[PDB]
Nucleic acid binder design. Sequence first.
RNA 1: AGGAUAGUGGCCUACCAUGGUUUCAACGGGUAACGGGGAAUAAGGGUUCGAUUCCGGAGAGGGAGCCUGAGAAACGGCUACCACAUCCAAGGAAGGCAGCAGGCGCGCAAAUUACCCAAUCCCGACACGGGGAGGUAGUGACAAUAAAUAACGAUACAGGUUGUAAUUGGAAUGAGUACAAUGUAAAUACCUUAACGAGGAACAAUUGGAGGGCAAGUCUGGUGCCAGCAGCCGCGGUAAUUCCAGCUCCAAAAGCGUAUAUUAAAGUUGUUGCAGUUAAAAAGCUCGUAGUUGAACCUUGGGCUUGGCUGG
Lengths: 132, 56, 178, 143
Amino acid sequence: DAVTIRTRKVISNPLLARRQFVIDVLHPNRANVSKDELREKLAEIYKAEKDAVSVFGFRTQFGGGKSTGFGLIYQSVADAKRFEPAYRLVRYGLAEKVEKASRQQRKQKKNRDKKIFGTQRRAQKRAARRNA
Amino acid sequence: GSLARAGKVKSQTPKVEKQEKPKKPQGRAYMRLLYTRRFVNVTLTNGKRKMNPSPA
Amino acid sequence: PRAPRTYSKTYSVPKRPYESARLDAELKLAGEYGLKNKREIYRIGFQLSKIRRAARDLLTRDEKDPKRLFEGNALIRRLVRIGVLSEDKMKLDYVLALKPEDFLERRLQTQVFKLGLARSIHHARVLITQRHIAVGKQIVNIPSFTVRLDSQKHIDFAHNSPYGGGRAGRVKRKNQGK
Amino acid sequence: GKGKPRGLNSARKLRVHRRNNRWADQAYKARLLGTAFKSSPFGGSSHAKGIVLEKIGIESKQPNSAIRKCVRVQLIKNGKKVTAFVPNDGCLNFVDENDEVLLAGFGRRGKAKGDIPGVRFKVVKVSGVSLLALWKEKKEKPR
RNA sequence: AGGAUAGUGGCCUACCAUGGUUUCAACGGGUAACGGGGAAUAAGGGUUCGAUUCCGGAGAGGGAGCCUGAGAAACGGCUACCACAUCCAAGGAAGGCAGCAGGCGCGCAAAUUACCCAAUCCCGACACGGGGAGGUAGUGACAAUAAAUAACGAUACAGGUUGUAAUUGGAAUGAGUACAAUGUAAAUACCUUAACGAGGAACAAUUGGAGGGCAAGUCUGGUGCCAGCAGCCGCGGUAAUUCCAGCUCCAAAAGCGUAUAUUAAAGUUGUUGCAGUUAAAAAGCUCGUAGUUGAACCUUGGGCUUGGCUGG
């Protein structure tokens, strides 16, 4: 319902090939506007690639009806993939979440491996020799 | 001295159950109740003010 | 670790707990501004104590003292802005003459009732706390919100409030549709 | 000349004189001599847990005529044996022998209170349960 | 003079002199003593505290000695002894939570064996790896901030044009419950917000107290110097304003009481600012050293020129 966006504090940053600004969201009679929709709305206004638009840090003012955030647009989708943080790419569907076990499992692996010198194949081969 | 007479009066006191009364207003509404009562409907008997008058 | 976050107390209790002159006078003050508890009188008394204390040190300094001159107008300007200090009393001497009644005059609850938006002073708080009063385009539910002069003329109901053109409330929809 | 030196170069004499004379003040002497740390049964603390050795009722002082009901408690931290009062109506029975009781002071700063002779402590809890709640039956003793 | 050191220096050695500190407190003892920035309280002056978010020092069970390395007398490095302690096949081997979490003890006394490198930064061969450093969540009434438990009407008595005490209603909202969206490394929570969600609106506020100090009963029932209460003074010995209950009322309020220490009150530690004939306290009296304190007196007046700021 009459979702109007205002961008202030705009600074052009060719050093990273992106333009950054503070986004003021006016969404009366609305709970709040999702991050994905403002990507289509902002990209169409600036005629830029949706996948090259990053928006985050949204906090709604008291009483509702107005939101503020921070906006990012890149000169290409490739630029967005190169410099935007990995978790943001997961949020926008531009990349997949890397699969790893919990921090406990990785830490106990490294300590267990440190008790072994050389290749892991040799140590078990000697271990297989020892008990047999 | 002995320990025999411990807890005498509390033991032989007849039990009375507290009467159920509607809850008084709390906080600000109670704060209203204290203002209107001693500063709107003054109960002085020509300058005679007793806060908790016993039945007399 | 992280740097500590500064905080300070905003109220203080009197040294003498039971003084019928003070006990009734506070009720006379709290009762007709509809303040919930005596601590809000304490908060005004605490803040007024250090406003007087700040002006006292400046008044001890010489006239044309740069510290008195700089801090004198800034402190006075901050009071003239909130409407506590009259515009003609910019002398740092009427600052000491200030009374806790003036500060309680600039509260939102006080102003909402005095602007006709509420039937009584008690109706102002319940109306405020239920998210109905909006200052300008911002909804405020703090009864102790002190009012600046530039915001006095902008005190009204929220545009989305059921009392000012908003949607029908919870009780209305449950009853009007059954 | 008020008896005390007034010279501008007499700061040592003034500082020494006051320092010696503060030992006449009872509060200051107990702090620096550390009497509460050395000799007080609580060792300078506020509360103290102990073991009830028996239950004893003590005659009140004059002009009152009564029998104040206390207990004899042996302390865990320092091995001392003291007497602790039980302030309420009828919870002498709630405190038992060989029981764990938390104690406190009478508020008189190590001195005897009222008509109770030779007693400086009161029972705050027994078996981990507040005696005030037990008297009001807000809880029951764990046994 | 030499040795040793990164280098000065009794830091160590040889020879030689008898020096050095001290009533302006040396040396010795205690410290319930890491130091400071600071904290609490404070009219001012002060008093107490400072293990603890920063800086500096020390320690890694207690000593001691070293390797590597620019940098260590390092302990998440080693060696030896001592005190403990684990596996053992009895031959041996491996130990250091005052790091994060957790366990026992000691206690008056203090948190989860949770998630993560996304933020701050650090380290490396370094855009990429690692970081219980750090950050996030859990317990949290250590404290601090804001702030619900109702507001408005009519019938009707009472009352001096309106403030109420009952039975008569319609509206409002978030505590809560929740689609969803944001928030976030991923979440939770906050914030926004569809829908549900308030009459005994049981969606029920508590802690203390009612003789004085100190605010609020000479009410009712219970016992009868017993029980007990009472910080102090006292209450209780048969109509208890003071105990135990009811009723009522008072203070503060999501907080209130109790214990201990400290600060103010304390001009009861007094420099500001005490007292000393009789309430505590002028040495029996002189001498006298350090200390403290010590008569007056040395270019004043006059004359001229000019700048600035105060009210005109």
